[PDB]
Design an enzyme around this catalytic site. Structure first.
Site: not given
Ligand SMILES: C[C@@H]1C[C@H]2CN1CCn1[nH]c3c(cccc3c1=O)-c1nc3c(cccc3[nH]c1=O)O2
Length: 290
Positions: A18, A119, A137
């Protein structure tokens, strides 16, 4: 994708990397996720329409050159990071209640359209500076089967997994998300994971040691579950006053209902919103450093 420029790798989801990236067109900063069977495509597209303030918005879906990129609104940090950072003093109760209330609204919306997260965990709960928290997610599980290991080989956490999933039920309901949220609720209050299992049986046994080994009394049909074993040890049920202090009576009453063994007895998100625990709910602004 030509229309985007990666700013930095902000995380590693279950399905792919990501990145925080900038849209050269709209100038908007976004979260770009790298993940193609027709079924997954139809599923993901359905997600572009289930919009809610407490659900991270799916902006666009780019299926190009046999690749899948999901463009999501960007949210600064996740709850896990915030929880670890607040280990010394803990998240103040007013904020914990606010986050729970908002999450329940997000779940009530998703569950009303028959979509489950499957999840939920601190890591995929995103929070902003304005006191809001959103589910991330959401719905990706049914589209892409949530594996035992990530693309990076990290073990998917079992800590928030509902007992019916652990016991082999293949057609689990929206109740699995309530279970997960209850586990998160307890963890925010105590600053310690409720059931930190490191294998399916250890996960199941930790649940049993705290809530008692389920039987036909508390959970009709449980002994017929695929992975239920008559040889499971018989643990006595602990008292919630010992499990989540100093959470008050209403909070303990609510958590108990979110952690009921029987998926049909477990409180729904909608009914949870009317619980007296939220009587004095407010929306405070958190103390987070970006
Ligand atoms: C959100 C979980 C955890 C990590 C991997 N992710 C899992 C993958 N993932 N990341 C996503 C984000 C936004 C919207 C949707 C998803 C998503 O499905 C974002 N992810 C994240 C982040 C960790 C620290 C800050 C931000 N900010 C974000 O905007 O992702």
């Amino acid at each position: 994708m030509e229309n985007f420029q990666k700013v930095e790798k902000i995380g590693e989801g279950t399905y792919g990397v990501v990145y925080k990236a900038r849209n050269k067109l709209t100038g908007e900063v976004v979260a770009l996720k790298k993940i193609v069977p027709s079924t997954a495509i139809r599923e993901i597209s359905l997600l572009k329409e289930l919009n809610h303030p407490n659900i991270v918005k799916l902006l666009d879906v780019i299926h190009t050159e046999n690749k899948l990129y999901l463009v999501f609104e960007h949210v600064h940090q996740d709850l896990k990071t915030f929880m670890d950072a607040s280990a010394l003093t803990g998240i103040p109760l007013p904020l914990i209640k606010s986050y729970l209330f908002q999450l329940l609204q997000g779940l009530a919306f998703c569950h009303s359209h028959r979509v489950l997260h499957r999840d939920l965990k601190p890591q995929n709960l995103l929070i902003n500076t304005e006191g809001a928290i959103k589910l991330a997610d959401f719905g990706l599980a049914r589209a892409f089967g949530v594996p035992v290991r990530t693309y990076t080989h990290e073990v998917v956490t079992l800590w928030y997994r509902a007992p019916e999933i652990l016991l082999g039920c293949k057609y689990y309901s929206t109740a699995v998300d309530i279970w997960s949220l209850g586990c998160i609720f307890a963890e925010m209050v105590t600053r310690r994971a409720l059931f930190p299992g490191d294998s399916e049986i250890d996960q199941l046994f930790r649940i049993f040691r705290t809530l008692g080994t389920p039987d036909e009394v508390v959970w009709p049909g449980v002994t017929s579950m695929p992975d239920y074993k008559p040889s499971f040890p018989k643990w006595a049920r602990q008292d919630f006053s010992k499990v989540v202090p100093p959470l008050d009576e209403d909070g303990r009453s609510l958590l108990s209902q979110m952690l009921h063994y029987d998926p049909n007895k477990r409180i729904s998100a909608k009914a949870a919103l009317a619980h007296p625990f939220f009587q004095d709910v407010t929306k405070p602004v958190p103390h987070l450093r970006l």
